[PDB]
Amino acid sequence: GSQEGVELEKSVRRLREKFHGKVSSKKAGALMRKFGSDHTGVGRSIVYGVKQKDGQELSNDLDAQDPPEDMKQDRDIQAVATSLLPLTEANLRMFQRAQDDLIPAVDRQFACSSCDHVWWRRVPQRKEVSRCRKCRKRYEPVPADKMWGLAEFHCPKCRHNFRGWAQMGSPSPCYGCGFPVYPTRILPPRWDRDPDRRSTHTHSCSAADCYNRREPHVPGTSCAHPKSRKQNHLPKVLHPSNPHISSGSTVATCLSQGGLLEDLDNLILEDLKEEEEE
Template identity: 50%
Template sequence: MSRFSEEVELEMSVRRLRENFHGKIPVDKATVLMRRYRNNHRMVAMEIILMKDRDLDEEDKWSLENDTVVRNVVQKLQTEEREQSERDARSSGASDDSKRSKQPKTSKQGTIKDRDIEELGKRLRVLPLTEKNMRMFDHAQKNLMPSVIHQFACETCDQVWWRRVPQRKRVSRCRRCKKKYDPVPPHKMWGIAEFFCLNCSRSFKGFGRMDIGSPCYICRSIILPTQILPPRRNMRDQGPRRRQQHSCLAEDCYNRQEPHVTGTECVHPRSRQKNNKPQVVNPSLPHISSGSTVNTCLSQGSLLEQVYELILDDIGEEESGEESDSSGSGHTVSS
């Protein structure tokens, strides 16, 4: 394996380990442990939880001082945390000193001595015996990272994307302006919607939004979507199906039904383009950081991208193009 690939794999492992332990493990110690156990999450979790009393051997000490892979990963992640801390301090108005005091500092003596790792284990072991902490240790030992899928939208850049993000850190960054956002609220999501008509027991998909109903093509009843579906590669490869031209009650729908509802707008891409309206219907709110979360490999991963490819892209300092939104033709759409 090349040194470049080793850095990518080690960085992924360190990010995942720190997320599993909710950011309680400093970057340098997480990197040392992951390198020692060759990215074996279970072994590292056991080392921390069981608090093994073992000094670093000569090979570990040599790695800390001379291993380019370890050094590069530690420097990158610590720089990332320091910059994030400074941004949080500016946005919240907190003093720089109080923020910097929370950041791990690079120290050869601190990392070489296994006593620091032992103290870390002690701190983790005396955490309150709560369901949340029990779940954290259980997930860490099993190398699990609970995640959820959310829609995000940047009004400034007029960009819409979906991300799989950690449950405890539901935040995503716009890849153009680099600002962080909270998810679009569930009742304001839009896109390819799933409908179920109680009158005729018919289910169908089409463009829609959660807060406005669309007519059923069979019984003409107005129904609300049950959910907005994230885009998938296989959505266009589901074989032949019946297609209905989109039509809704929105005032600006390109195929408007009557009587239309004044003041409503259609979310179908054709209607948005025809009326010179932006892609973003309901923008995400800017994220206000509490300083309690850490950057993770999962938080920047999209549904259509691989984590490995994203980190390679990040290391190469190249921005890839935005994902194109799924534009599959729907049976109906909400306004």
């Protein structure tokens, strides 16, 4: 796959997302060809306009930055800055983040019921949405208190610590003392972390359900691991994402995914391929 395509699309997406999608793709594309994918500097240049064209005390809460004169004088940048007025108390933190080259972000879990597809994605804090890669529909996150995966347990009674595949809000029995322990959190699968965070990792459980049950087992418990789920003919998805209803300002995934298993350049490349066909 040609990287210069992935990187062009990445930088149009990043310019847009720093303006919460209020800059168009056709316009971002032009800006990114003409200025060599420099979303940071285009972005900084737009905010300079807004600060300049705004007459409120609010615009002193924006930094005054040096815009390349070929950007300061560009009429398409300037028209964008106008198109984004006015500057409001509800607008102002968007514009600050844009000039700080900042897209605040969060790792979230996602679950497409009809694909029975679960995945993780680093998404923007302003719009925690990711697209199912099997069926191409956008979904909202699984709620924090319903997430499942490799979980960390800290028994409050005896201080045994253990790791295991599990869902939030569902106690497991402490292997130490038998009292019920709720998971503290879920750890996403990551190539730079312990492989026990992967579903591919060998798993053994005290649940009666378990595809690979530990002994002694606990008689009325059910295992969250997808192999167990499948073996018991249950859907791998324990708790589906609500489908996301598009409001219009969404920007497709342009965030670096860190050590999550699905990296960004491949996500974008598959996106560009899908478009070639259509």
